[PDB]
Motif scaffolding. Structure first.
Motif, mmCIF file in Angstrom:
data_model
loop_
_atom_site.group_PDB
_atom_site.id
_atom_site.type_symbol
_atom_site.label_atom_id
_atom_site.label_comp_id
_atom_site.label_asym_id
_atom_site.label_seq_id
_atom_site.Cartn_x
_atom_site.Cartn_y
_atom_site.Cartn_z
ATOM 1 N N UNK A 59 15.213 30.717 -54.212
ATOM 2 C CA UNK A 59 15.475 29.520 -55.017
ATOM 3 C C UNK A 59 16.269 28.508 -54.208
ATOM 4 N N UNK A 60 16.221 27.248 -54.624
ATOM 5 C CA UNK A 60 16.925 26.191 -53.898
ATOM 6 C C UNK A 60 18.410 26.454 -53.936
ATOM 7 N N UNK A 61 18.861 26.721 -55.151
ATOM 8 C CA UNK A 61 20.241 27.001 -55.449
ATOM 9 C C UNK A 61 20.831 28.038 -54.523
ATOM 10 N N UNK A 62 19.986 28.842 -53.896
ATOM 11 C CA UNK A 62 20.485 29.882 -53.008
ATOM 12 C C UNK A 62 20.518 29.452 -51.550
ATOM 13 N N UNK A 63 19.888 28.323 -51.247
ATOM 14 C CA UNK A 63 19.802 27.863 -49.866
ATOM 15 C C UNK A 63 21.083 27.549 -49.119
ATOM 16 N N UNK A 64 22.014 26.861 -49.763
ATOM 17 C CA UNK A 64 23.239 26.513 -49.057
ATOM 18 C C UNK A 64 23.889 27.761 -48.488
ATOM 19 N N UNK A 65 23.992 28.778 -49.327
ATOM 20 C CA UNK A 65 24.618 30.023 -48.939
ATOM 21 C C UNK A 65 23.956 30.678 -47.741
ATOM 22 N N UNK A 66 22.723 31.144 -47.904
ATOM 23 C CA UNK A 66 22.022 31.805 -46.807
ATOM 24 C C UNK A 66 22.133 30.965 -45.534
ATOM 25 N N UNK A 67 22.193 29.655 -45.724
ATOM 26 C CA UNK A 67 22.294 28.734 -44.609
ATOM 27 C C UNK A 67 23.633 28.942 -43.896
ATOM 28 N N UNK A 68 24.722 28.979 -44.664
ATOM 29 C CA UNK A 68 26.056 29.189 -44.109
ATOM 30 C C UNK A 68 26.209 30.570 -43.481
ATOM 31 N N UNK A 69 25.432 31.527 -43.980
ATOM 32 C CA UNK A 69 25.481 32.894 -43.498
ATOM 33 C C UNK A 69 24.821 33.060 -42.138
ATOM 34 N N UNK A 70 24.018 32.085 -41.732
ATOM 35 C CA UNK A 70 23.359 32.180 -40.437
ATOM 36 C C UNK A 70 21.851 32.337 -40.547
ATOM 37 N N UNK A 71 21.331 32.085 -41.743
ATOM 38 C CA UNK A 71 19.899 32.185 -41.999
ATOM 39 C C UNK A 71 19.155 30.919 -41.581
ATOM 40 N N UNK A 72 17.956 31.084 -41.045
ATOM 41 C CA UNK A 72 17.154 29.945 -40.633
ATOM 42 C C UNK A 72 15.674 30.270 -40.799
ATOM 43 N N UNK A 73 14.821 29.249 -40.775
ATOM 44 C CA UNK A 73 13.388 29.473 -40.889
ATOM 45 C C UNK A 73 12.985 30.300 -39.687
ATOM 46 N N UNK A 74 12.065 31.248 -39.877
ATOM 47 C CA UNK A 74 11.593 32.130 -38.809
ATOM 48 C C UNK A 74 10.740 31.498 -37.714
ATOM 49 N N UNK A 75 10.667 32.196 -36.588
ATOM 50 C CA UNK A 75 9.873 31.738 -35.477
ATOM 51 C C UNK A 75 8.421 31.753 -35.925
ATOM 52 N N UNK A 76 7.746 30.587 -35.928
ATOM 53 C CA UNK A 76 6.348 30.608 -36.361
ATOM 54 C C UNK A 76 5.538 31.454 -35.403
#
Lengths: 26, 286
Positions: free
Chosen positions: B211-228
């Motif tokens: 969900x969008x609402x969860x994006x800020x967090x995972x983002x701060x945790x070090x999450x990023x879009x995967x290597x295509x």
């Protein structure tokens, strides 16, 4: 240097912690 | 290419609806410039009532800037028209958005067409930066195709023309934009970043499932879009750097332009793919 994905299933995300560049400190 | 042309509510003709969004609906139309017996094909966007309501003089100003953007990779505002509603007129883009397009050709697009679009899109944003202008809504869905070899960033100024008064593309927004509603050329570079990812993964939805609402967090945790899949480490790496927490460490458009230009010079060495002229949007404009 590509992605060895287990059946091309490319995961929602990829993490870069602990590297502090992408990991904010709260 | 010149200043903003104000039309009279009888200098253009709405021929057919092509599709409505949230900022308003769009039609395929013609332009009958009072005087000459010429009629040029455009696209008429009739915005919807804004909550804040900027008087006919301010709206009129933002429109000039939108009209002043002169670059081969950034749609320019041709003509505005104020009545009980506002309508924007621009050169119609045959193939539709670059998003639907890459999805619709996931096995027809070669390493060269991608790298190129990357360079062109950079080029365009670099221009908008030279003019001290922040887009705020870059994204594959906002990159229209004039030809498989020429794309341009669109909607510049439309967002802010209504939603900067106090929905949101959280997944394209940079951390700061999300947390503090901060926008800068550096926050755009973040978005550029996602836009390149959408392309490289032939139109895959970013952070799909989360969900969008969860994006800020995972983002701060070090999450990023995967290597295509088709991306060598070299390419992905640049996509990653646009997502650093510190805006100031994110590549600058002029840097990006140079990088992709280089790769475009040996595509098959940076993108590995197995191995067009059409789009169902085009089928609706024929």
């Amino acid at each position: 240097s590509l992605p060895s994905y287990l059946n091309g299933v490319m995961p929602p995300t990829q993490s870069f912690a602990p590297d502090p560049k992408y990991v904010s400190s709260k | 290419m010149a200043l903003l042309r104000i039309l009279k509510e009888t200098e253009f003709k709405k021929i057919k609806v092509l599709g409505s969004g949230a900022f308003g609906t769009v039609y395929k139309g013609l332009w009958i410039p009072e005087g000459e017996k010429v009629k040029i094909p455009v696209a008429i966007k009739e915005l919807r009532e804004a909550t804040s309501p900027k008087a006919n003089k301010e709206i009129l100003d933002e429109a000039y800037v939108m009209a002043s953007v002169d670059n081969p990779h950034v749609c320019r505002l041709l003509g505005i028209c104020l009545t009980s509603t506002v309508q924007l007129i621009t050169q119609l883009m045959p193939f539709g958005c670059l998003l639907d397009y890459v999805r619709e050709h996931k096995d027809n697009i070669g390493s060269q067409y991608l790298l190129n679009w990357c360079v062109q899109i950079a080029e365009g944003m670099n221009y908008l930066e030279d003019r001290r202008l922040v887009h705020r809504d870059l994204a594959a869905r906002n990159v229209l195709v004039k030809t498989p070899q020429h794309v341009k960033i669109t909607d510049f100024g439309l967002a802010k023309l209504l939603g900067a008064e106090e929905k949101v593309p959280i997944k394209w927004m940079a951390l700061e934009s999300i947390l503090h509603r901060i926008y800068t050329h550096q926050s755009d570079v973040w978005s550029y970043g996602v836009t390149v990812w959408e392309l490289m993964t032939f139109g895959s939805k970013p952070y799909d499932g989360i969900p969008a609402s969860e994006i800020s967090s995972i983002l701060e945790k070090g999450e990023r879009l995967p290597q295509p899949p088709i991306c060598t480490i070299d390419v992905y790496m640049i996509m990653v750097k646009c997502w650093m927490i510190d805006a100031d460490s994110r590549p600058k458009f002029r840097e990006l332009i140079i990088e992709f230009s280089k790769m475009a010079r040996d595509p098959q060495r940076y993108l590995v793919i197995q191995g067009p002229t059409d789009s169902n949007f085009y089928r609706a404009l024929m």
